[PDB]
């Protein structure tokens, strides 16, 4: 297990979003779900020259998993997944200059549920999860698990568990007081209300 600071910008943006009092929780899903249609239209596009990448799976498309006992919210995607320099090092250079433009956007009256403009909507999952696993795989890399429970570190280990073929599974574990999000009524609504048009069939599991 190796362990990682994240910039500065980056722990100050993760502390605004669990320090802010802001009761429209629920946009983290469409936050999510947009990311993951961003990782599919990748793929997808990528597969039109080089139609091997899919020989990792054909099948393009969002699961939402909720887990009463473990209380948990899971995102996957067959997207394009992540490397390890991603986790590492892109995914917050990207953030950087996001997380300033999000930020002077709040000053100017803004608000959190904007996050999305900037390229910063994963870190929207801190709004209802305490800790936050994210499972990954990129054809040209090994699969990782990603964890932080923010406080301005992460880590980074190879993923032992179930292989996935490529993509992304994103395991929200829920502040105590956010388990709406696990309620299949709950979940249904929020897709229908934010991700309707998403152009990857988004299939709810149920407990
Ligand atoms: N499902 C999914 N697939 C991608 C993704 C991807 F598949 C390729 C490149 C960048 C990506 N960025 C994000 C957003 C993201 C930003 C920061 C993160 C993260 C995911 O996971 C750990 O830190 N996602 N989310």
Same mark, same amino acid.
């Given at each position: 297990v190796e362990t990682f600071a994240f910039q500065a910008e980056i722990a100050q943006l993760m502390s605004l979003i669990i320090n802010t009092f802001y009761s429209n929780k629920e946009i983290f899903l469409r936050e999510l779900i947009s990311?993951?249609?961003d990782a599919l239209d990748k793929i997808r596009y990528e597969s039109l020259t080089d139609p091997s990448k899919? @020989?990792?799976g054909k099948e393009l498309h969002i699961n939402l998993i909720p887990n009463?006992? @473990?209380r948990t919210l899971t995102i996957v995607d067959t997207g394009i997944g992540m490397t390890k320099a991603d986790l590492i090092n892109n995914l917050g250079?990207?953030?950087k200059s996001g997380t300033k433009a999000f930020m002077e956007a709040l000053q100017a009256g803004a608000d959190i549920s904007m996050i999305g403009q900037f390229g910063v909507g994963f870190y929207s999952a801190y709004l209802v999860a305490e800790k936050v696993t994210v499972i990954t795989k990129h054809n040209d890399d090994e699969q990782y698990a990603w964890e932080s429970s923010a406080g301005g570190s992460f880590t980074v280990r190879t993923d032992t568990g179930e292989p996935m073929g490529r993509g992304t599974k994103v395991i929200l574990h829920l502040k105590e007081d956010q388990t709406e999000y696990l309620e299949e009524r709950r979940i249904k609504?929020?897709?229908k209300k934010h991700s309707q048009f998403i152009g990857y069939?988004?299939?709810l599991f149920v407990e």
């Open positions: 990311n993951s249609s899919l @020989d990792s009463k006992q @473990d250079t990207i953030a609504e929020i897709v069939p988004i299939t």
